[PDB]
Amino acid sequence: DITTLTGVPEEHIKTRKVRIFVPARNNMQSGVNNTKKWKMEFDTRERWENPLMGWSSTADPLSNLVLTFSTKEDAVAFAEKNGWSFDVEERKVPKPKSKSYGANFSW
């Protein structure tokens, strides 16, 4: 634990959680590249609206933060070094599937 070393206010090592996962493919895309490699998104908090101009004014210190990884164990251990609450999720690689142009012409 390195909580004292980081200047981070207690609130945000406490009352919020990281949410490790390998990101899903954008489904509009047929691409696969961005899918791989663990990342460490935090939970969303409140974000209201600017009384003037209608801007999405926001309070939380660290909403936009996000971090890539090569391995999940490294990620969990990472947050543990930070003393972080976490929600590890499985890599969900698609099952391989059989394909056949001629099966379309059975009968």
Partner 1 sequence: NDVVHKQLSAFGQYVAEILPKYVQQVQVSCFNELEIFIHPDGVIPVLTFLRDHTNAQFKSLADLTAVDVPTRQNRFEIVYNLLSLRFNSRIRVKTYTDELTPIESSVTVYKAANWYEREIWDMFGVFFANHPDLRRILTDYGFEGHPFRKDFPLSGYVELRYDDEVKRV
Partner 2 sequence: KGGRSSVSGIVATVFGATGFLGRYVVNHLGRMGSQVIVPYRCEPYDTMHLRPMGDLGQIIFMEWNGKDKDSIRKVVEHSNVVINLVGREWETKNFDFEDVFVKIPHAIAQVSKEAGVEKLIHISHLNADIKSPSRYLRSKAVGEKEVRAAFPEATIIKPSDIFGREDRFLNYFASMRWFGGVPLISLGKETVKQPVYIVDVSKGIINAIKDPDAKGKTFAFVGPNRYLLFDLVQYIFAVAYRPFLPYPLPHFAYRWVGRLFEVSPFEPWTTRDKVERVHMSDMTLPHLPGLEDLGIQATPLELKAIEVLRRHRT
Partner 3 sequence: DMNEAKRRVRELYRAWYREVPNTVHLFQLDISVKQGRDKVREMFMKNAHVTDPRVVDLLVIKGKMELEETINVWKQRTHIMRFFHETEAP
Q: List residues binding partner 1 (CB under 8 A).
A: 2, 5-9, 12, 40, 61-62, 64-65, 67-71, 74, 78, 81
Question: CA angle, corner 33, sides to 38 and 93, nearest 5?
Answer: 60
Both tokens of residue 93?
Answer: 């690689």
Q: What type of residue sits at position 97?
A: K
Q: Does 62 bind partner 3 (CB under 8 A)?
A: no
Q: How far apart are CA 24 and CA 39, in angstroms?
A: 11
Q: Does 1 bind partner 3 (CB under 8 A)?
A: yes
Judged by CB under 8 A, the residue of 15, 29, 36, 48 near partner 2 is 48
Residue 53 beta carbon to partner 2: minimum distance, rounded to whole angstroms: 8
Both tokens of residue 94?
Answer: 């698609």
Residues at the interface with partner 3 (CB under 8 A)? 1-2, 4-5
